[PDB]
Coordinates of N, CA and C in Angstrom, one line a residue:
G1 N 102.7 72.4 87.6 CA 102.9 72.1 89.1 C 104.3 71.7 89.3
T2 N 105.2 72.2 88.5 CA 106.7 72.0 88.6 C 107.5 73.3 88.8
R3 N 108.5 73.2 89.7 CA 109.3 74.4 89.9 C 110.8 74.0 89.8
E4 N 111.6 75.1 89.7 CA 113.1 74.8 89.6 C 113.8 76.0 90.2
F5 N 114.8 75.7 91.1 CA 115.6 76.7 91.7 C 116.6 77.3 90.7
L6 N 116.9 78.6 90.9 CA 117.9 79.2 90.0 C 118.8 80.2 90.8
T7 N 120.1 80.2 90.5 CA 121.0 81.1 91.1 C 121.5 82.2 90.1
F8 N 121.5 83.4 90.6 CA 121.9 84.5 89.7 C 122.9 85.5 90.4
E9 N 124.0 85.7 89.8 CA 125.0 86.6 90.3 C 124.9 87.9 89.7
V10 N 124.4 88.9 90.4 CA 124.2 90.3 89.8 C 125.2 91.2 90.3
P11 N 126.1 91.7 89.4 CA 127.2 92.6 89.7 C 126.8 94.1 89.7
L12 N 126.5 94.6 90.9 CA 126.1 96.0 91.0 C 127.3 96.9 91.2
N13 N 128.4 96.5 90.8 CA 129.7 97.2 90.9 C 129.4 98.7 90.6
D14 N 128.4 99.0 89.8 CA 128.2 100.4 89.5 C 126.7 100.6 89.2
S15 N 125.8 99.8 89.8 CA 124.4 99.9 89.6 C 123.7 100.2 90.9
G16 N 124.5 100.1 92.0 CA 123.9 100.4 93.4 C 123.2 101.7 93.4
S17 N 123.7 102.7 92.5 CA 123.1 104.0 92.5 C 121.6 103.9 92.3
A18 N 121.1 102.9 91.6 CA 119.7 102.7 91.4 C 119.1 101.6 92.3
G19 N 120.0 100.6 92.6 CA 119.6 99.5 93.5 C 119.6 98.2 92.8
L20 N 120.7 98.0 92.0 CA 121.0 96.8 91.3 C 120.3 96.8 89.9
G21 N 119.3 97.7 89.7 CA 118.7 97.8 88.4 C 117.5 96.8 88.2
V22 N 116.7 96.8 89.2 CA 115.5 95.9 89.2 C 114.5 96.3 90.3
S23 N 113.2 95.9 90.1 CA 112.2 96.2 91.0 C 111.4 94.9 91.3
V24 N 111.1 94.6 92.6 CA 110.4 93.4 92.9 C 109.1 93.7 93.6
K25 N 108.1 92.8 93.5 CA 106.8 93.0 94.1 C 106.4 91.7 94.8
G26 N 105.8 91.9 96.0 CA 105.4 90.8 96.8 C 103.9 90.7 96.9
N27 N 103.4 89.4 97.0 CA 101.9 89.2 97.1 C 101.6 88.1 98.1
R28 N 100.3 87.8 98.2 CA 99.9 86.8 99.1 C 98.8 85.9 98.5
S29 N 98.5 84.8 99.1 CA 97.4 83.9 98.7 C 96.2 84.6 98.3
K30 N 95.5 84.2 97.2 CA 94.3 84.8 96.7 C 93.1 84.3 97.6
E31 N 93.3 83.4 98.4 CA 92.2 82.9 99.3 C 92.4 83.4 100.7
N32 N 93.6 83.7 101.1 CA 93.8 84.2 102.5 C 95.0 85.2 102.5
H33 N 95.4 85.6 103.6 CA 96.5 86.6 103.8 C 97.8 85.9 103.9
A34 N 98.0 84.8 103.2 CA 99.3 84.0 103.2 C 100.3 84.5 102.2
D35 N 101.3 85.3 102.7 CA 102.3 85.8 101.8 C 103.0 84.7 101.0
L36 N 103.0 84.8 99.7 CA 103.7 83.8 98.9 C 105.1 84.1 98.6
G37 N 105.4 85.4 98.6 CA 106.8 85.8 98.4 C 106.9 87.0 97.4
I38 N 108.1 87.2 96.8 CA 108.3 88.3 95.9 C 108.7 87.9 94.5
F39 N 108.3 88.6 93.5 CA 108.6 88.2 92.1 C 109.1 89.4 91.4
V40 N 110.1 89.2 90.5 CA 110.7 90.3 89.7 C 109.6 91.1 89.0
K41 N 109.4 92.4 89.5 CA 108.4 93.2 88.9 C 108.9 93.9 87.6
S42 N 110.1 94.4 87.7 CA 110.7 95.0 86.5 C 112.2 95.0 86.6
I43 N 112.9 95.4 85.5 CA 114.3 95.5 85.4 C 114.8 96.8 84.8
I44 N 116.0 97.2 85.2 CA 116.6 98.4 84.6 C 117.8 98.1 83.7
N45 N 117.5 98.2 82.4 CA 118.5 97.9 81.4 C 119.7 98.9 81.5
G46 N 120.5 98.8 82.5 CA 121.6 99.7 82.7 C 122.6 99.2 83.7
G47 N 122.1 98.4 84.7 CA 123.0 98.0 85.8 C 123.1 96.4 85.8
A48 N 123.6 95.9 86.9 CA 123.8 94.5 87.1 C 122.6 93.7 86.6
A49 N 121.4 94.0 87.0 CA 120.2 93.2 86.6 C 120.1 93.1 85.1
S50 N 120.6 94.2 84.4 CA 120.6 94.2 82.9 C 121.7 93.3 82.4
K51 N 122.9 93.6 82.7 CA 124.1 92.9 82.3 C 124.0 91.4 82.7
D52 N 123.2 91.1 83.8 CA 123.1 89.8 84.2 C 122.5 88.9 83.1
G53 N 121.5 89.4 82.4 CA 120.9 88.6 81.3 C 120.4 87.2 81.8
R54 N 120.1 87.1 83.1 CA 119.6 85.8 83.6 C 118.4 86.1 84.5
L55 N 117.9 87.3 84.6 CA 116.8 87.7 85.4 C 115.5 87.5 84.6
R56 N 114.4 87.3 85.2 CA 113.1 87.2 84.6 C 112.0 87.9 85.3
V57 N 111.3 88.8 84.7 CA 110.2 89.6 85.3 C 109.0 88.7 85.7
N58 N 109.2 87.9 86.7 CA 108.2 87.0 87.1 C 108.7 85.9 88.1
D59 N 110.0 85.7 88.0 CA 110.7 84.7 88.9 C 110.4 85.0 90.3
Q60 N 110.2 83.9 91.1 CA 110.0 84.0 92.5 C 111.3 84.0 93.3
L61 N 111.4 85.0 94.2 CA 112.6 85.1 95.0 C 112.6 84.2 96.2
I62 N 113.6 83.5 96.5 CA 113.7 82.5 97.6 C 114.9 82.8 98.5
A63 N 115.9 83.4 97.9 CA 117.2 83.6 98.7 C 118.0 84.8 98.1
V64 N 118.8 85.4 98.9 CA 119.7 86.5 98.5 C 120.9 86.6 99.3
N65 N 122.1 86.4 98.7 CA 123.3 86.5 99.5 C 123.4 85.5 100.6
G66 N 122.8 84.3 100.4 CA 122.7 83.3 101.4 C 121.5 83.3 102.2
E67 N 120.8 84.5 102.3 CA 119.6 84.6 103.1 C 118.5 83.9 102.4
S68 N 117.5 83.5 103.2 CA 116.3 82.8 102.7 C 115.1 83.7 102.8
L69 N 114.6 84.1 101.6 CA 113.4 85.0 101.5 C 112.1 84.2 101.8
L70 N 112.2 82.8 101.5 CA 111.0 82.0 101.7 C 110.3 82.2 103.0
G71 N 111.0 81.8 104.1 CA 110.4 82.1 105.4 C 109.9 83.5 105.6
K72 N 110.5 84.4 104.9 CA 110.2 85.8 105.0 C 109.0 86.2 104.2
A73 N 108.2 87.1 104.7 CA 107.0 87.5 104.1 C 107.3 88.4 102.9
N74 N 106.3 89.1 102.3 CA 106.6 90.0 101.3 C 107.4 91.2 101.8
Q75 N 107.0 91.7 102.9 CA 107.7 92.9 103.5 C 109.1 92.5 104.0
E76 N 109.3 91.3 104.6 CA 110.6 90.9 105.2 C 111.6 90.7 104.1
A77 N 111.1 90.0 103.0 CA 112.0 89.7 101.9 C 112.3 91.0 101.1
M78 N 111.4 91.9 101.1 CA 111.5 93.2 100.4 C 112.6 94.0 101.2
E79 N 112.6 93.9 102.5 CA 113.6 94.6 103.3 C 115.0 94.0 103.1
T80 N 115.0 92.7 103.1 CA 116.3 92.0 102.9 C 116.8 92.3 101.6
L81 N 115.9 92.5 100.6 CA 116.3 92.9 99.3 C 116.9 94.3 99.3
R82 N 116.1 95.2 99.8 CA 116.5 96.6 99.9 C 117.8 96.7 100.8
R83 N 117.9 95.7 101.7 CA 119.1 95.6 102.6 C 120.3 95.2 101.8
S84 N 120.0 94.2 100.9 CA 121.1 93.7 100.1 C 121.5 94.7 99.0
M85 N 120.5 95.3 98.5 CA 120.8 96.3 97.4 C 121.3 97.6 98.1
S86 N 121.1 97.8 99.4 CA 121.5 99.0 100.1 C 123.0 98.9 100.5
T87 N 123.4 97.9 101.2 CA 124.8 97.8 101.7 C 125.1 96.4 102.3
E88 N 124.8 95.3 101.6 CA 125.1 94.0 102.1 C 125.3 93.1 100.9
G89 N 124.3 93.1 99.9 CA 124.4 92.3 98.8 C 125.6 92.7 97.9
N90 N 126.0 94.0 98.1 CA 127.1 94.6 97.4 C 128.4 94.4 98.2
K91 N 129.0 95.5 98.7 CA 130.2 95.5 99.5 C 131.3 94.7 98.8
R92 N 131.1 94.4 97.5 CA 132.1 93.6 96.7 C 132.0 94.0 95.3
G93 N 130.8 94.1 94.8 CA 130.6 94.4 93.4 C 129.5 93.5 92.7
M94 N 128.8 92.8 93.6 CA 127.8 91.8 93.1 C 127.0 91.2 94.2
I95 N 125.8 90.7 94.0 CA 125.0 90.0 95.0 C 124.4 88.8 94.5
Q96 N 124.2 87.8 95.3 CA 123.6 86.5 94.9 C 122.1 86.6 95.2
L97 N 121.4 86.0 94.2 CA 119.9 86.0 94.3 C 119.3 84.7 93.8
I98 N 118.8 83.9 94.7 CA 118.2 82.6 94.3 C 116.7 82.8 94.1
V99 N 116.1 82.1 93.1 CA 114.7 82.2 92.7 C 114.2 80.8 92.3
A100 N 112.9 80.8 92.0 CA 112.2 79.6 91.6 C 111.4 79.9 90.3
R101 N 111.5 78.9 89.4 CA 110.8 79.1 88.1 C 109.9 77.9 87.9
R102 N 108.6 78.1 87.4 CA 107.7 77.1 87.2 C 108.0 76.3 85.9
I103 N 107.4 75.1 85.7 CA 107.6 74.3 84.5 C 106.3 73.8 84.0
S104 N 106.3 73.5 82.7 CA 105.1 73.0 82.0 C 105.5 72.5 80.6

């Protein structure tokens, strides 16, 4: 029942071709239709997400490039992500992505 926020700087300087080199998936409460957020579904060992070496196929996304995915549902955060990986998170050669990790 413990969580921890984490910040990751992913340099898509040359990974934008694929979209940072990672795939995310969003879900909702198992009791109702309450979107919980998005979690790293997979990673592409070739771009920023790979070279980052700080990503985890399960971490919960809460923010990206200053934006807050929390308040955003699965679809909204997924769009902000696609938006960041499309032409916002980059525009420099990297994008910020905050997440949450459980503890035990």
